[PDB]
Design a binder for these strands. Structure first.
Ligand SMILES: [Mg+2]
Ligand SMILES: [Mg+2]
Ligand SMILES: [Mg+2]
Lengths: 153, 154
DNA sequence: TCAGACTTCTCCAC
DNA sequence: TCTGACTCCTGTGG
DNA sequence: AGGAGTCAGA
DNA sequence: AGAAGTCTGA
């Protein structure tokens, strides 16, 4: 539980509300109990020419990783435990994606209890929809109603 | 001069480094002293769906205007005097765009003296090229060399 | 003349 | 099984 | 920016 | 994001 500087969070929040992205998605997984897995993500996009800025962020945050894919580099953070602790400090300074942050945190806290009953799993899948709704959902496929069709078995 | 909150300057600097922009232009102006007008500009582009965010900027900064462009809205600030005061306070928090900001402030200070001899005017025009080079210039047309050709003709 | 108010354009960086 | 590191793709919003 | 995938070690 | 412009009034 590394604590982050307030002035660091303020700048970062402004950068996140601009080029950052708080994603929460459902992926097919035939090896899990409900044939679907959850994926919470903290993304910060920037062009590869300025990938160094993303590298500096891996150190300041501590955990996380930067990937390249063409003329664009991406800082990711999918690891649950540090993600919850990170957003919990970042959230009060967001002005655009603040709603997405509180939703992701709520999912993370209700993550173990959502592996027991299918209805509790569907409820979380609903919370996932409430995040893509706020975002610019363009290429989203697997939703909560997708699970419902498969869950009926 | 207006003083801004550090908390506001910290958040905004990140947003400026993210989706904001810092421009320096040399516009053709036949009714000008040297057939050209200098227009320094600080802008924050954002989706019109989130225009309210740009509307708050006008109140928080105290100046500037917000216009549309289809699905794109822009908060511009070209008024030289409050611009100089704003970028002076925003610069220490800029990371990706601190170099451009200090160059704008550098131009503004030497602006009335630039209207003297063309050689002093052209030096400032070269300082505009520096700002453009730092930015991801794609559709730039008028540079200092455009001015040089015109003034060497008269 | 001039300087601020308003719009149009276009690609790549998200 | 279940998590995280890793790549790839699309379409506007800068 | 917002997703869609894949794959291996644990 | 980063330019290209027009148009008023003082
Ligand atoms: Mg943005
Ligand atoms: Mg940017
Ligand atoms: Mg952007």
């Amino acid at each position: 539980n590394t604590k982050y500087n307030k002035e660091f969070l303020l700048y970062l929040a402004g950068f996140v509300d601009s080029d950052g992205s708080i994603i929460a998605q459902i992926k097919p997984n035939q090896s899990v109990k409900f044939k679907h897995r959850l994926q919470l993500t903290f993304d910060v996009t920037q062009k590869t020419q300025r990938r160094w800025f993303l590298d500096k962020l891996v150190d300041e945050i501590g955990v996380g990783y930067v990937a390249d894919s063409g003329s664009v580099s991406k800082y990711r953070l999918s690891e649950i435990k540090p993600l919850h602790n990170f957003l919990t400090q970042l959230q009060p300074f967001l002005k655009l994606k603040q709603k997405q942050a509180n939703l992701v945190l709520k999912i993370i806290e209700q993550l173990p209890s959502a592996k027991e009953s299918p209805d509790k799993f569907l409820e979380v899948c609903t919370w996932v929809d409430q995040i893509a709704a706020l975002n610019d959902s363009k290429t989203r496929k697997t939703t909560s109603e997708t699970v419902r069709a498969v869950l009926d078995s």
